[PDB]
Design a protein around this nucleic acid. Structure first.
Lengths: 164, 67, 135, 122
RNA sequence: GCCAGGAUGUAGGCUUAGAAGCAGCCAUCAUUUAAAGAAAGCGUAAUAGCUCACUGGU
RNA sequence: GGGUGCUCAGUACGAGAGGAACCGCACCC
């Protein structure tokens, strides 16, 4: 089972699960075949059978829940870095403004529940309560201009191994 | 570390080189006098218990080079 | 208008005069009109060198002159002849008007040896007639 | 219209005096040339002893045509002859003098040296 | 399987421009250890880094 | 998606010879 830490409220309605906490609120739907129940202080996942596909579904469902619980409790984040002369990021309102070698800048506005911080001109941090949504926005930012092979210029995840 | 057993033994033995050891021993030298002395100086770096052990090792490096 | 030619030459003794000499395309040869002293007219193949005005005669007493016709026996060896008769009084059947005149080579008894232009040699009866001249 | 086998006067001092059009460049289907088009041609007449010779194949840009061109401003310009400029490959003339007036249409096709050397541009 | 150790003399000697556990030649001891080769691979110019052997845990 | 002209730029890059690329404009199909 998944332990429900303090301050965290878990709600289950059929195959949709809502988890709220200090760092945010996330709602997620799971595979119909899986039964999810809040057993007092822990979330339990029950698969219908012992075949393989179910055993695999069971562990996958469990992980997603664990991470949903980690996100709203332990406010999540993903960092990116700019590499290239003249390449810089700034915060203009809720908007991220990127100068990455195009004629004009690229402006990105996070959706509800997501924040983007720019602590230095070559570092971008995406944060929020939903680990998935954080992962997805950071992949979309990197995709504006991914690292080029000859010199490694572009946007890369903080620890991205991109050997020239 | 201190001078390796090899160089210590070289300087002790009185030579500038090692060998083809089993066949051509490169020089002789006195143990209970010399091998012990080296065992003494090399001690801070030897994981030995007794000096007698400290020695067995030194004498053991002398074989590898033939002395 | 193909003319009637006399290949018989039997008007013996009666003198004739070469009236004219004209071409006969039906004979590819020349023919002469002969006016005889008795009023009769006749055409003959005109030998070579025969001219208007010359007299013509036939028979044993004829003069040996081109155009004259006599029995082979009355003709001098070496003379050229044409319109040679093979049968006395049957007219000439050899060299009538085309070719090359034969030639008398010798006379023996009742025969006259003649060499045709083809090198061919024949012994014709002297009674047979022939015209002096070249055709 | 200028097409294959059309004869063109040469408006430069390259040595060529007249060329005969072989083909109009620009893609399958092109058949007629007007100002600015490039043709492949054979030198029909040339000054003896020069750099360009009779029978040689050259590329030339059309700079004046009897057909003329209709312009965006409502004007229409034409010339009394069909002329071209050979060309080195960079569009510069091989000769050093240009004789007679040339059409301003040449300016649009980047024949700047010819336009500068021309006695007059109409 | 996964977690953590895998160490000290010491870069053994010799040789080699370098030669450091891991070009090659001799050897291959001893220490502190639960255990841990004078090291079985990768790696380095040489170093470093990484694995492996052995040990603990689970 | 494509044709064509152009621009990006003689910039980046390269010891030099040389010499882009990614971004973007226009007419047309």
């Amino acid at each position: 089972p998944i332990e429900i830490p303090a301050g965290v409220t878990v709600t289950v309605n059929g195959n949709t699960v809502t988890v709220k906490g200090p760092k945010g609120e996330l709602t997620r739907t799971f595979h119909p075949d899986m039964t999810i129940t809040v057993e007092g202080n822990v979330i339990t996942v029950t698969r219908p059978s012992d075949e393989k596909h179910h055993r695999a579904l069971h562990g996958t469902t469990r992980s997603l829940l664990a991470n949903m619980v980690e996100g709203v409790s332990k406010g999540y984040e993903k960092a990116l870095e700019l590499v290239g002369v003249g390449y810089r990021a700034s915060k203009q309102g809720k908007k991220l403004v990127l100068s990455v070698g195009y004629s004009h800048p690229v402006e990105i506005e996070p959706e509800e529940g997501l924040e983007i911080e720019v602590p230095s001109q070559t570092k971008i941090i995406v944060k929020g309560a939903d680990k998935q949504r954080v992962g997805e926005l950071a992949a979309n930012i990197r995709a504006v201009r991914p690292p080029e092979p000859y010199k490694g210029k572009g946007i890369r995840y903080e620890g991205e191994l991109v050997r020239l | 570390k201190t001078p390796p057993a090899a160089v210590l033994l070289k300087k002790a033995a009185g030579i500038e080189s090692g060998s083809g050891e089993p066949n051509r021993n490169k020089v002789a030298t006195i143990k209970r006098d010399k091998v012990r002395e080296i065992a003494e100086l090399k001690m801070p770096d030897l994981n030995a218990a007794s000096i007698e052990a400290a020695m067995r090792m030194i004498e053991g490096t002398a074989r590898s080079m033939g002395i | 208008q193909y003319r009637i030619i006399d290949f018989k030459r039997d008007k013996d003794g009666i003198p004739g005069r070469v009236a004219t000499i004209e071409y006969d395309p039906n004979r590819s040869a020349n023919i002469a009109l002969i006016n005889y002293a008795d009023g009769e007219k006749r055409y003959i193949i005109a030998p070579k060198n025969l001219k208007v005005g010359m007299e013509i005669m036939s028979g044993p007493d004829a003069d040996i002159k081109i155009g004259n016709a006599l029995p082979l026996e009355n003709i001098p060896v070496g003379t050229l002849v044409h319109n040679i008769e093979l049968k006395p009084g049957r007219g000439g059947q050899l060299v009538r008007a085309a070719g090359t005149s034969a030639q008398v080579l010798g006379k023996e008894g009742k025969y006259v040896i003649v060499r045709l232009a083809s090198g061919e040699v024949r012994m014709i009866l002297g009674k047979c007639r022939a015209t002096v001249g070249e055709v | 219209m200028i097409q294959q086998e059309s004869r063109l006067k040469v408006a430069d001092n390259s040595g060529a005096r007249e060329v005969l059009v072989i083909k109009v460049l620009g893609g399958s289907g092109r058949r007629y040339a007007n100002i600015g088009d490039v043709v492949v041609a054979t030198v029909k007449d040339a000054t003896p002893g020069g750099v360009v010779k009779k029978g040689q194949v050259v590329k030339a840009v059309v700079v004046r045509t009897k057909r003329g061109v209709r312009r965006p401003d409502g004007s229409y310009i034409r010339f009394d002859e069909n002329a071209c400029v050979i060309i080195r490959d960079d569009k510069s003339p091989r000769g050093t003098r240009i004789f007679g007036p040339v059409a301003r249409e040449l300016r649009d096709k980047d024949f700047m040296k010819i336009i500068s050397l021309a006695p007059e541009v109409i």
